[PDB]
Design a protein around this nucleic acid. Structure first.
Lengths: 192, 411, 101, 184
RNA sequence: GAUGGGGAAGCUCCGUUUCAAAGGCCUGAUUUUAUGCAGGCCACCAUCGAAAGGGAAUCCGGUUAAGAUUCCGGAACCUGG
């Protein structure tokens, strides 16, 4: 029920989404990973963030491959995630108020031409000029994790979900280990 | 016969206390209230409180004895016990350590269906439409909420799919009659066979989930409404000659993921269903295309989404602070034009909603007695005083509105 | 094809045959609470505080109408969940009493 | 004040067993494999759970289906039957023996450790007959034994046997003295 | 006089609260690792036993082949809803 295909990595800045894997079990976050994920503000499990697939980030993505998974979400998934989940960490001081007010986008940016959430969605989906500015303003979305229950049915569901990781997620640990790319649309349809 | 005790006949046995009802049913309050919600049972207040409550003055809640007795025969009660036994046996297997046994047990279980509850609760099809307002409201609210530890992702996905199917059916038949926009969200008042059903649609923005509310009741309500709406949609599609379930184009689902995604096929009667006939409207990035597109599609022709692969149109909808180019081939109209057009139903002039122009306010579519009173009785006097106070309070609605209008008119 | 069958069909039965089966009591229509209502309906700053000081269940107007100049400026509603929760609780817990107005 | 008769009876039985002197043949239990080595044994035994009814049924149906259209060695599994365990014991075929300390009829298991040590077969006492039952697709068996094992787990079995000998067999050989139940 | 028990091979005798898990009232938004129930109070415990014991209530007039606080006329009083 799964297919694989070896594809040569290009140099174009493709849109990618990163989801925290929270593993391996026995590995303690090394200093290298501690800094790499800290710079990407992926310091919490289930955290999601949008990045640019530049050649300067490929080695970091390969290094943090065990700790996270990557993929190419569609425009619909990005729009749904942005309009259903959001964070605004600014004076309101550390208040986590969410994008319920388009006027806030006008106030914070104003001159960048981003006046509504749809503008941010379009900029992210089309690698807009304000991608760097909006993404920092668009603090990472706290995606809901898996079943998140300890019980009769919940434990059984968790076991089945875990068993699929071996058939879907694997790492060779070699320098030539290709980066694993999976359809983020299905994962979002499962997480969300 | 011998003496009959006071608290043994009449209201004493006509209504059963909630605590006594739970004991008689031998069912937990959670399951009892789940069954009550499924059957749509409600408490009742007799004309005398102490008489019903065994002569005791307490804030007791009373329920009709006949309804509770009929409830006891529902198969859902046995299904609840079966589910409890299955859960206990599955916990036993999990504690034992034979996961395979738990999987085998899970593969055998089947969930109960509320089909027979709907039949008795709604004997005739029009009854379901006459009360589907709450179901539509709950489904539209849940479809926009984010999945959490309480509500599973599958439930929200199913609710969103049901809402999308309902919207597609409404658009295909052009049954929209009146619409309204408020702080709570946008309102839609369709006409399903003449029921003038109204359903609120909140804005597609993130919503905070406070811990104060209890989704457990909401989960059961949504579970019932899911089957209710599924049956209603199937009946409507069969009546309209449309295939069911309506398949969805994955290509459109990737791009827009909404109304146009569902390609419903088989196998116009009102001015509201004729507005913007043969017209094509362009929608900007700022406007809620999800809300605007459905209204235009139900009223008139198709809509060109601002989304692209990331003209022959006649009007363009934009809400930017300053118009960008204003090509001569596209008429620029504020989003308020569509709502006002639907409310009026006669294509209100577009020269009042140009970009940057002030929008008009939006309106929802929906002496001798002094002495003569001496002869009035005490009860009649009190009733007249209450009526006079009710008239005076209603007069304030006009007085304080006219005063505020006068104050505003200064500038 | 689960649930894909017409359980109603051609029928004319009435559920109100028993008087105890009271009406669902659909919510009243909205009135002048639009996102762009007349500015006269706006509550004064002191009246806003007075209304906020009121307890729950005495809050006919559950918000302060505001004159939003543009549709894009219309913010989201966080109390939508609360309103639906209250309506659901009232539906299956509020004592229903038959009366003539 | 009053409690259920059975609860009082069992509490009295407990407080009597705690206070009644017993011969060394009794109280040979209560000196049991520690939590660490017990968990290690469970982990080792968890890989050899006997095929349950459903598993055997599905395997047989699958084999029959393939046969209808038209070689492997004996599956190694734990031996738990008391009659079968006592038959592997006294014959030297048994390599590891587990004994439950909470058997209702004490006489059914008093002689098992003595026979195991007499025959020079490694034996271990583990708390809880249910724990043995949970890993054998039964409520309880009161005994568990091991037979020929996969080459991969041979080293683990040898290490577990050595650990058991070092921890329980050698340390608690003094159990012959110190009549149990002497607590004030 | 069962009830929970003891003796008696047994038809059976003892024992009435006897060291019984001996029922009868109320509350909650639906009980938070997510819709399998939580909490508050009292500790007695069947039945039979009186037409002279306590009791809810009918008085008068007339009537028959035998019946009257009952049958007829009038006017009364108690219980429940």
């Amino acid at each position: 029920g799964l297919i694989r295909e070896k594809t040569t990595y290009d140099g174009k800045p493709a849109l990618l989404f990163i989801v925290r894997v929270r593993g391996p079990l026995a590995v303690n976050i090394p200093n290298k990973a501690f800094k790499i994920l800290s710079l990407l503000r992926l310091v919490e499990t289930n955290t999601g963030v949008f990045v640019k697939l530049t050649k300067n980030v490929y080695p970091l993505l390969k290094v943090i491959a065990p700790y996270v998974v990557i993929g190419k979400p569609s425009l619909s998934s990005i729009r749904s995630l942005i309009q259903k989940r959001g964070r605004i960490i600014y004076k309101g001081e550390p208040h986590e108020i969410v994008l319920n007010d388009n006027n806030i986008v006008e106030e914070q940016l104003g001159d960048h031409g981003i006046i509504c959430v749809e503008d941010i969605i379009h900029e992210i989906a089309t690698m807009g000029e304000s991608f760097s500015v909006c993404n920092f303003f668009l603090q990472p979305f706290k995606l809901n994790r898996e079943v998140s229950g300890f019980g009769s049915l919940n434990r059984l569901r968790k076991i089945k979900q875990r068993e699929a990781e071996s058939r879907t997620r694997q790492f060779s640990n070699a320098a030539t280990a290709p980066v694993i790319e999976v359809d983020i649309d299905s994962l979002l349809a499962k997480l969300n | 016969m011998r003496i009959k005790k006071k608290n043994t006949r009449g209201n004493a046995r006509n209504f059963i206390t909630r605590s006594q009802a739970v004991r008689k049913l031998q069912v937990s309050l959670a399951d009892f209230r789940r069954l009550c919600i499924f059957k749509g049972i409600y408490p009742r207040e007799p004309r005398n409180k102490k008489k019903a409550n065994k002569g005791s003055t307490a804030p007791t809640t009373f329920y009709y004895a006949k309804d509770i007795q009929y409830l006891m025969h529902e198969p859902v009660l046995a299904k609840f016990r079966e589910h409890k036994t299955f859960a206990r046996k599955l916990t036993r297997a999990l504690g034992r350590g034979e996961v395979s046994s738990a999987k085998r047990l899970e593969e055998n279980r089947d969930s109960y269906t509320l089909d027979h509850i709907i039949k008795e609760r709604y004997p005739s099809f029009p009854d379901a439409i006459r009360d589907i307002d709450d179901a539509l409201n709950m489904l539209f609210l849940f479809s926009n909420l984010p999945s959490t530890n309480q509500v599973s992702s599958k439930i929200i996905n199913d609710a969103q799919k049901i809402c999308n199917q309902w919207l597609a059916y409404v658009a295909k038949e052009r049954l929209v009659r009146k619409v309204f926009v408020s702080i709570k969200g946008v309102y839609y008042q369709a006409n399903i066979k003449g029921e003038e059903v109204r359903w609120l649609v909140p804005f597609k923005f993130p919503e905070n989930i406070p811990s104060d509310v209890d989704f457990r009741i909401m989960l059961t309500f949504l579970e019932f409404y899911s089957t209710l709406l599924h049956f209603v949609l199937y009946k409507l599609y069969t009546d309209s000659g449309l295939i069911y379930p309506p398949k969805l184009d994955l290509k459109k689902d990737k791009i827009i993921s909404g109304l146009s995604s569902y390609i419903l096929e088989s196998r116009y009667d009102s001015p509201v269903a004729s507005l913007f006939s043969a017209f094509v409207f362009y929608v900007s990035r700022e406007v809620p295309i999800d809300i605007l597109e459905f209204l235009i599609l139900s009223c008139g022709g198709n809509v060109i989404s601002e989304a692209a692969m990331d003209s022959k149109v006649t009007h363009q909808i934009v809400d930017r602070p300053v118009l960008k180019n204003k090509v001569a081939g596209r008429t620029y109209i504020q989003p308020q034009w569509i709502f006002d057009c639907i409310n009026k139903g006669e294509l209100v002039p577009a020269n009042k909603y140009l970009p940057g122009e002030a929008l008009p306010p939006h309106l929802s579519p929906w002496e001798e007695k002094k002495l003569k009173m001496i002869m009035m009785s005490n009860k009649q006097k009190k009733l007249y005083k209450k009526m006079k106070y009710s008239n005076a309070k209603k007069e304030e609605q006009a007085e304080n509105l006219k005063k505020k209008k006068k104050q505003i008119a200064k500038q | 094809e689960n649930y894909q069958y017409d359980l109603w069909g051609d029928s004319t039965e009435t559920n109100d045959h028993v008087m105890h089966l009271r009406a669902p009591k659909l919510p009243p229509p909205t009135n002048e609470e639009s996102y762009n209502p007349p500015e006269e309906y706006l509550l004064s700053p002191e009246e806003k505080e007075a209304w906020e000081n009121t307890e729950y269940s005495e809050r006919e107007r559950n918000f302060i109408p505001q004159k939003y100049s543009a549709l894009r400026k219309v913010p989201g509603y966080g109390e939508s969940i609360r309103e639906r929760f209250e309506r659901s609780l009232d539906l299956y817990l509020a004592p229903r009493v038959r009366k003539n107005k | 004040v009053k409690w259920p008769e059975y609860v009082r009876v069992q509490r009295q039985k407990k407080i009597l067993s705690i206070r009644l002197k017993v011969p060394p043949t009794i109280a040979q239990f209560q000196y049991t494999l520690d939590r660490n080595t017990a968990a290690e044994t469970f982990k080792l035994f968890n890989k050899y759970r006997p095929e349950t009814a459903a598993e055997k049924k599905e395997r047989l149906t699958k084999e029959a289906a393939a046969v209808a259209e038209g070689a492997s060695p004996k599956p190694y599994a734990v031996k738990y039957g008391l009659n079968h365990v006592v038959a592997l014991i006294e014959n030297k075929k048994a390599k590891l023996v587990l004994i439950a300390n909470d058997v209702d009829p004490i006489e059914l298991v008093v002689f098992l450790p003595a026979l195991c040590k007499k025959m020079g077969v490694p034996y271990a006492i583990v708390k809880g007959k249910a724990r043995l039952g949970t890993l054998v697709n039964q409520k309880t068996s009161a005994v568990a034994a091991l037979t020929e094992v996969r080459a991969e787990d041979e080293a683990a079995l040898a290490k577990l046997v050595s650990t058991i000998d070092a921890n329980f067999a050698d340390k608690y050989d003094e159990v012959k003295k110190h009549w149990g139940g002497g607590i004030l």
